TrEMBL record:
This is Secreted protein. It comes from Mycolicibacterium smegmatis (strain ATCC 700084 / mc(2)155) (Mycobacterium smegmatis). Keywords: Signal. The chain holds residues 33 to 153 of 153 of the full protein. Disulfide bonds join 17-108.
Length: 122
């Protein structure tokens, strides 16, 4: 039920980067996407914020096989991901579209892996 790029962009399933690398890249090369995401994030309660960080860290901790199985799970069942009951767009910056995915993954490796400052906005 998944395609190569939907629901999760191919480049995102293949990248060696952390979430924080992709976010730092977005801040520079996809700033509108970054700012839309952080605006959404900052409006969520702390428990939801924490859950999104934990879940995206889990996602990028997997290899391609794990990421692809997640994509398949969410392609076959739109309600697979429990976080979506609280925040459907918890991973919008990462998974929304392949153009953003290509731009961010083209440069994410140039950024530091663990820079948590990307989670602080205003
Ligand atoms: O497709 C609905 C399903 O997708 C999830 C996967 O975690 O949401 C992420 O992926 C979507 C599809 O690419 C993005 O549009 C969305 O912004 C992102 O959070 C789940 O939350 C949801 O159950």
């Amino acid at each position: 039920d998944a395609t190569d790029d939907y629901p999760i962009p191919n480049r995102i399933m293949r990248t060696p980067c952390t979430a924080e690398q992709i976010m730092a890249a977005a801040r520079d090369v996809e700033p509108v996407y970054y700012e839309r995401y952080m605006t959404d994030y900052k409006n969520k309660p702390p428990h939801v914020q924490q859950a999104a960080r934990d879940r995206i860290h889990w996602f990028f901790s997997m290899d391609y096989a794990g990421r692809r199985q997640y994509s398949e799970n969410t392609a076959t069942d739109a309600f697979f991901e429990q976080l979506a009951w609280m925040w459907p767009n918890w991973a919008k910056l990462f998974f929304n579209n392949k153009g953003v995915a290509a731009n961010t993954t083209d440069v994410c490796e140039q950024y530091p892996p663990d820079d948590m400052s990307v989670w602080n906005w205003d």
